Design a protein around this motif. Structure first.
Motif, mmCIF file in Angstrom:
data_model
loop_
_atom_site.group_PDB
_atom_site.id
_atom_site.type_symbol
_atom_site.label_atom_id
_atom_site.label_comp_id
_atom_site.label_asym_id
_atom_site.label_seq_id
_atom_site.Cartn_x
_atom_site.Cartn_y
_atom_site.Cartn_z
ATOM 1 N N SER A 17 0.865 -1.167 0.000
ATOM 2 C CA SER A 17 0.000 0.000 0.000
ATOM 3 C C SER A 17 0.903 1.218 0.000
ATOM 4 N N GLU A 19 0.174 4.515 -0.608
ATOM 5 C CA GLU A 19 -0.647 5.695 -0.786
ATOM 6 C C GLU A 19 0.122 6.967 -0.478
ATOM 7 N N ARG A 62 -10.186 -2.326 8.379
ATOM 8 C CA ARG A 62 -9.926 -0.900 8.493
ATOM 9 C C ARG A 62 -11.254 -0.170 8.577
ATOM 10 N N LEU A 63 -11.465 0.547 9.670
ATOM 11 C CA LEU A 63 -12.683 1.313 9.892
ATOM 12 C C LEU A 63 -12.276 2.761 10.078
ATOM 13 N N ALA A 64 -12.623 3.608 9.124
ATOM 14 C CA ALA A 64 -12.267 5.014 9.180
ATOM 15 C C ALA A 64 -13.516 5.874 9.187
ATOM 16 N N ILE A 70 -9.423 10.397 3.262
ATOM 17 C CA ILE A 70 -9.378 9.036 3.766
ATOM 18 C C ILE A 70 -8.684 8.195 2.709
ATOM 19 N N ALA A 71 -7.389 7.961 2.889
ATOM 20 C CA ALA A 71 -6.595 7.181 1.945
ATOM 21 C C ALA A 71 -6.398 5.774 2.498
ATOM 22 N N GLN A 72 -7.436 4.957 2.381
ATOM 23 C CA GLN A 72 -7.337 3.565 2.788
ATOM 24 C C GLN A 72 -7.689 2.630 1.651
#
Lengths: 72, 72, 72
Positions: A17, A19, A62-64, A70-72
């Motif tokens: 990842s 990002e 992943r809980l945002a 929000i870069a998930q």
């Protein structure tokens, strides 16, 4: 290899990842995210078997909860 | 390999995610996301078998709640 | 390989996602996303078998709730 790369010889699992972000807010007299009432509940209660040979690279959720980036 | 790349020799599972973003807000006297009442509930309660040889690269759910930029 | 690429020799599963975005808001005196009442419930409760040899690259659900940019 120059910045990080799995290089196994039998099995290579990964969660690469990369990002790379940029955020440039501006302006004035501006509200961002007045009230937040969040209830994240990532309650992992899994189970395994008598020979479960898991090989997960990232075994989690992943809980945002954001307002702008929000870069998930 | 120059920035990260699985290179196995039998099995290569992955969740490559290269989300390179840019966000440029502007302007003034502006509300963004007044009230948020979120209830994320990613409650993983899975199960495995007597020989389940899982090989997941990312075994989890992404739950996001944003207002402007959600790069998932 | 120059920015990340599975290169297995038997089986290569992947979830390549290269979402390169750009967002340029502007203007003034503007509301974006006044009220949000979200109820994400990605409650994975799956099950495996006596020889289930899963090979998922990404075993999870993406649940997003945004107002402007949702790159999933």
């Amino acid at each position: 290899g120059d910045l990080g790369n799995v290089t196994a010889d039998k099995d290579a699992v990964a969660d690469v990842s990369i990002e790379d972000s940029v955020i440039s807010l501006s302006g004035d007299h501006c509200i961002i995210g007045r009230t937040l009432v969040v209830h994240e509940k990532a309650d992992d209660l899994g189970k395994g078997g008598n020979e479960e040979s898991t090989k997960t690279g990232n075994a989690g959720s992943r809980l945002a909860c954001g307002v702008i980036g929000i870069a998930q």
